[PDB]
Rho-associated protein kinase 1 (Homo sapiens), 759 residues
Amino acid sequence: SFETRFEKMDNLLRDPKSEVNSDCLLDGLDALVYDLDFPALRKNKNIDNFLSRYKDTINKIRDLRMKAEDYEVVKVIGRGAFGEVQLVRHKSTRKVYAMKLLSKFEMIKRSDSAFFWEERDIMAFANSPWVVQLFYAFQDDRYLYMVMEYMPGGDLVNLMSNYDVPEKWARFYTAEVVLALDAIHSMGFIHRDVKPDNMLLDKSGHLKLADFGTCMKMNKEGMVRCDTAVGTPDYISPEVLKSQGGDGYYGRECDWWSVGVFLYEMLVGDTPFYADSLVGTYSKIMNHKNSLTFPDDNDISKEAKNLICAFLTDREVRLGRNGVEEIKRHLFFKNDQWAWETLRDTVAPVVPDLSSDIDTSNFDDLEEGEEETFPIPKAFVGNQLPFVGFTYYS
Amino acid sequence: MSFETRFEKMDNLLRDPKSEVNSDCLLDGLDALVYDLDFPALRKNKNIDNFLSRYKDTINKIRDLRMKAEDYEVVKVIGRGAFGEVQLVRHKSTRKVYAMKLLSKFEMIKRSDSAFFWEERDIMAFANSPWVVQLFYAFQDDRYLYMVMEYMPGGDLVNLMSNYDVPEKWARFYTAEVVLALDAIHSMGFIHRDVKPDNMLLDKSGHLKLADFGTCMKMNKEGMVTPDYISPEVLKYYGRECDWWSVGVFLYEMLVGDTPFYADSLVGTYSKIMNHKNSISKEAKNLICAFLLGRNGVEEIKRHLFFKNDQWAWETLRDTVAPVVPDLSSDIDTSNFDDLEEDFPIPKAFVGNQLPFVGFTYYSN
Ligand SMILES: CN1CCc2nc(NC(=O)c3cccc([C@H]4CCCN4C(=O)Nc4cccc(C#N)c4)c3)sc2C1
Ligand SMILES: CN1CCc2nc(NC(=O)c3cccc([C@H]4CCCN4C(=O)Nc4cccc(C#N)c4)c3)sc2C1
């Protein structure tokens, strides 16, 4: 039908979740100009006639649509594998944001050019207080940019380093992670990277997850198949650690292992499977039945020890294997202060004392090293193609 | 400048039908990219493979949704050109009757003539003049370019001169219509470069309107930019005066019966044009020699003694009764059109054969 055709056709161009969205279609024309404008390629009569027709307008569009120049970089608050997070202020609106830039070169070289898609969807369409919001997503020939919600309270690895965390506080932050992970599992995702570095605090001192670059969409049975181990050497689970070609089948239970590791470091001060060599950690995780030992001097309760050991076991005997309510039911979470249904509405243990909209007291100082860039191509390579459709505004 | 104002201007370019980076033109890019990249040799590239696995499925969904040649039923082949043909079509859903021009993408890539259609597109789509054949829809596939236009049931002026012994009264009318038609094209900043009776078509009322614009070119700076109708200055930048030469050639052929510079060999015609100085009314002769004038303005042409008549006025010429009005029995009547017969390689690396056609798609209203 003619009428039904243009109803669906126009639906595909305004939809923010659509692959062929208005802002995603421009990314194609933009990447094409980036990848074709070279002397060797310009020798082609077809490539030359395209560039002479679209280079003029594509430059005007480059100035109009969101660019890195529109943002005033205040301070580098974080640093990752493929980039760094900066505290930015938009030059026109004067709004304060946290911007994460991802190196397109480091992504092409290391063949890791697909991890950002799930993170882009989760942050933009989560609609949960447990997830750091993504306001704008843009790009250029060199980087991918993610203009997100700024967390003035800082990361949790900054909290345990600056405070001697008691059990009362540990009870709160663990319960927040449990509720936050359940929200991610509700969207049908396994985080595969639960660590205090990814847990960030807002202006009120409440927890919300931030790095969703290790997330995977769960199947109808709540499982996932992976030929590659992903996470952090200390927080990684034994079933997801040995995950290789053939034997790489696991559910959401691997995310509960990382909660136990987190609670241990929160109370003991060190990770449970820490070793001076990275291979030593690997062997300790697989031998958790004999490797997991608590220090002789204890500030920690019997129920906290039970909750750690309930999480730090084999997948088939691990806590949370039969719903999230199984975890909520544990004796360690039984308290007089808060309730599960209204946990984010109660007062946080630490509330950040903020003097200005650009306060970075909770983030420890970092150096602002030279990077590599793509060589000129002798023929079409299309290095900008795996990034087409990343641009988001809504 | 400012954030809020940048989003308004960016949204304008996306909706604007005259814009190069229009909504329908942006899809052409993604469409051409899938056409040119989906090959085994190219799919060996990790970047090309990851793009196609992500966009080929959704682009095929769009190809079905967007306008196709399958949406129209071909009634009769009314015309034929160098790179294509003109067919009388009926849109299967709306049942509307149109004239559809096809252009071979292979013939354009081979012969290197992959830019002539751009002026033909802009003139027809954004003219908003009764003197220009309207373009309703413009679409494409991996094989052709399609131009869904206004159908002219009255036919071409070549058929008129062949079927009627054209008197001066008729010649005065059709010449004045061409003059008003060319003035409208010059107003848009375009020079025809090939004004001939084959390009002049008649509507249901018998009124003239120009159609073939493959020889046109946009005016450089102020106003500067095929045989026998070719002007000597073209032969060798020239202005809009070259189109007025072709009007005189047209008026001559309409009254005499033959072209003024006709020769049995094509080479002979070329020499006769350059030697125009040596190669049935006095006022008709005065006009033919005047064009062989109009350099200053169009009013100079209108104020000639040949155009002085009791029948029509220059301001209301298209509103008066035409000399010949086509007798049409049906919406698919092709009596004024003479009958005609009904009837690339896999790349080893990126060639981008669909790239000079990106941005051709147009949808009116
Ligand atoms: C192995 N492959 C799969 C997954 C993967 N993943 C990557 N990731 C990165 O390259 C990266 C860059 C900058 C920053 C971060 C992380 C780690 C440090 C803090 N951070 C925040 O995103 N912080 C934050 C996030 C949101 C808001 C605020 C604030 N305020 C801070 C990560 S390469 C890569 C490759
Ligand atoms: C060297 N280069 C110069 C520019 C150029 N140009 C070309 N041209 C073509 O390929 C072509 C195809 C079909 C039809 C026509 C022309 C000539 C015959 C009729 N016609 C109508 O366009 N007719 C009409 C146009 C609009 C409405 C109706 C009706 N009814 C009829 C031309 S190759 C070429 C290459």
